[model samples]
Target: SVPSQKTYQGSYGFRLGFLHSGTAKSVTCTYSPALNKLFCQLAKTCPVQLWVDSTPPPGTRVRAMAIYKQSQHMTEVVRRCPHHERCSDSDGLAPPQHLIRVEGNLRAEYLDDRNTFRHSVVVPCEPPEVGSDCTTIHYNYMCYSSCMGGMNRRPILTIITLEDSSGNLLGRDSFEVRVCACPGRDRRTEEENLRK
Candidate 1:
């Protein structure tokens, strides 16, 4: 049986979003009182830089607010969940999950693989300059943001994403966390709330 709806002074569901890149192979959207979406960053190469932008889908009825990103760059966005569905048949009512592909930007082409050689070469000198490069090799560089180590291929779901401005998250990109059944009670302050 569906859980009985406990009515208080107010009650509402939440909305959430997700981000992905070429590196990701797949993701799973879920229905939980705690979370609306999840992003599985199963990528081999992480992007060196991530630029992010978010928008409400046309005619989406969910209210949302962007919260945080894993990086200084807006490569990922954390949004507050919307209460209830936004369309007929309870489809839109369910929190919407987006599998976003972090596409390489053409505008950032110059930024991508743009390299300069502060190059030096190992000269047959009596000695090396205090650990300076004796030889010059081509510096190849391109990076994408990712979970430093990454998640183990198992269902150990005891993760809490810390506030990005000053905290640690167990997941990469943006994924939803378990939302509390209580409206407006997200994990951002969950621990404190739980403690109280």
Candidate 2:
């Protein structure tokens, strides 16, 4: 199925090294259905180039698109991948090691007892094959139903926390989900009859 039009937002400290120099900034990512691309925009300084796919590739730690300035009315493209799987310029560099938190919403049911309605997920942190300390984290959430009791429809706030081996809290993120009593199966039929 086509991926849902979900948006993820986060902020990170900016680095000044080879190509660009800037301070800390925020990032917003969303999938555009009309353009059929995943667009990521960096805060005011430099906008990251659009990803021409439903989602970013696996094992992609960080992606940054830099705009080069040489003369007026001219520009250059420099792709910066901090710890990506494949990149021409990011080879041989040690990938930065740190905690990353991603969040998304999923529909679920709630049970009063210790029922199976409570949903949770766990992500493992491991070292990448080639890069030292680079890890790609893709957070996904989906709704599923099983044979059980009645379900209450409402919105729930889901949180994911990441901690280091030393038991220190590294990062935390969250998403909002709405649980439903039943799926919308007859909406199409109702709409068609209304059109008639």
Candidate 3:
């Protein structure tokens, strides 16, 4: 038997953390194993500037595609999925799907927007730029700390999340982001280890 907190070597599972807003949900990422490049410009682990807009105008744009909003002490945390009977039952176990949320911060009030603008605008993960706007966004991914064996590895799942105005969990939604690949494995069988 495998530990509830940890899975067996032979049989395994992996959990994805989903980020969401109203109207739509999505798992944000993509990767080329060879390059190990993370496609999601907004992924916290990848880029420095965090690509919210490619060509941001000088001052501002109405219905702006992205806005540089700074949230301090604001965190996106991952933990065992909360409040779902089925997911709770199993990790629902082995590899439990984690719930990600922006939690308690006095200045993070902007994150609760009903328009879902905050998540789309890339976060400044690099050095302090403050109010200085940028003409272009630049950052890269050094991810991929897994694929333990040559072809045998855990599932790297991507997903989007949904939260109500109260910033409470509404539901789970996901997208499988491709970050790496194995030559000998089949997408069918590879997907087997991806999830249930």
Q: Which candidate ranks first by TM-score, i.e. highest? A: 2
TM-scores, all candidates, are 0.17, 0.25, 0.23
Q: For candidate 1, lDDT tens digit of each residue in 95-136?
A: 222111122322111111113211111111111146642311
Local accuracy of candidate 2 as per-residue lDDT tens digits, 1-196: 1111123332221111111222122223332222222222211111112111122223223321111122331121111123321323211222211111123212211111133222233343333447432333343222211112211122223333343344233334333322122212222233346568
Off by over 4 Å in 3: 1-142, 145-152, 181-196
Q: Per-residue lDDT tens digits of candidate 3, residues 19-69? A: 221111232333334322233422133221212223322322111011111
Clashes of 1: 22
For each candidate in turn, give its C-alpha RMSD to the true structure in angstroms. 23.6, 21.2, 17.8
Candidate 1 vs candidate 2: which has greater lDDT?
2
TM-score of 1: 0.17
Residue 83 error, candidate 3, Å: 34
Q: Tell me how candidate 2 scores on lDDT.
A: 0.25
Least accurate 10 contiguous residues by lDDT in model 1: 117-126
Compare candidates 1 and 3 on TM-score and give the better one. Answer: 3
Greater TM-score among 2 and 3 belongs to 2
